[PDB]
């Protein structure tokens, strides 16, 4: 299909996201792909499988956004600055970041997403720790937790100036 | 005691597990453990519920708001006092459960942030004439991530940590 079967695993992400892992259904995901059903079934006949996919295939996202955070960082040279930016980029993006989110959200009372959500801060702390100090790593990614969570509860994000001064208040010393 | 109560609680818990599209008598009914939907029926003929449920949950909010507030009038040290409740909110996750869930959901569901937005604006009303602006603004985003990093992580910052990130924050 050049990719029948990656729309279906794109879309079971979504689906998995907006109705949790125990509301995945062929039709539902067909309905979030637009794709006929006979193609869903033919290739996921188990849906645990289409779990393990929608799951694998968010935390492959997961770590690639990572890894782009991890090489910008390097270069930049500046800390607050660069993750002040970063983090901008990401509440702007709420196209296929959505998903991440409601997965990282759910995963709050919901043991089965964590193993997914734990990407985030362990991947953060790994970057930060050894540049601020496990102390000031911690801090600010609760306060990117924060930033994110906030951010979509009262409908306006931190500005890029904001950030960056919660940031250096939060690496400072 | 009072069975409209049970069920009204109920509904809140079922609410903060299944959404509110989520929401059933069925469901209720179970989670009340009122013998059959029909008192779920009675007590809540069409899903009307759904208010009152929000409503009891925002009158916990808000209740728990006005002890923070008190708090607050009753000391000087500003970050240890609200690092200290904070601490407090973080121990008592049984208790605070159905609340935390609603807040996480309301991330994506706008029906449920009237409710949700009692805390940032509560929270960002006590503090702003004390610190201002920006600094009120910053403590409840650090808290919201706060609670939420601790959920996810499965350990929460002490009232040292806590203190510390808030006296950061509170500077001018
Ligand atoms: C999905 C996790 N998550 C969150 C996040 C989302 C929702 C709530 C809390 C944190 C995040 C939040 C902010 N502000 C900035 C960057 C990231 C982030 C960056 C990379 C990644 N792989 C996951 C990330
Ligand atoms: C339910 C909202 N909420 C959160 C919160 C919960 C989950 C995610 C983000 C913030 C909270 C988080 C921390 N750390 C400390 C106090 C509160 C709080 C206090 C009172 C209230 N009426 C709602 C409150």
């Not at 992400?13 to 309905?31: D, P």
Request: glycine share 6%.
């Amino acid at each position: 299909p050049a990719g029948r079967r990656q729309a279906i695993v794109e879309a079971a992400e979504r689906v998995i996201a907006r109705q949790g892992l125990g509301g995945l259904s062929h039709r539902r995901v067909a309905a979030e792909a637009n794709v006929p059903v006979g193609s869903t079934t033919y290739y996921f006949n188990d849906l645990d499988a289409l779990r393990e996919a929608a799951l694998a295939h968010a935390a492959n996202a997961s770590a690639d956004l990572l890894a782009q955070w991890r090489s910008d960082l390097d270069k930049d040279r500046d800390l607050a600055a660069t993750l002040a930016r970063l983090t901008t980029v990401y509440l702007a993006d709420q196209d296929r970041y959505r998903t991440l989110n409601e997965l990282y959200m759910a995963a709050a009372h919901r043991p089965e997403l964590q193993r997914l959500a734990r990407l985030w801060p362990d991947g953060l702390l790994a970057l930060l720790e050894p540049r601020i100090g496990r102390r000031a790593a911690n801090a600010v990614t609760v306060f990117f937790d924060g930033a994110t969570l906030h951010a979509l509860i009262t409908g306006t994000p931190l500005s890029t100036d904001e950030l960056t001064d919660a940031i250096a208040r939060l690496v400072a010393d």
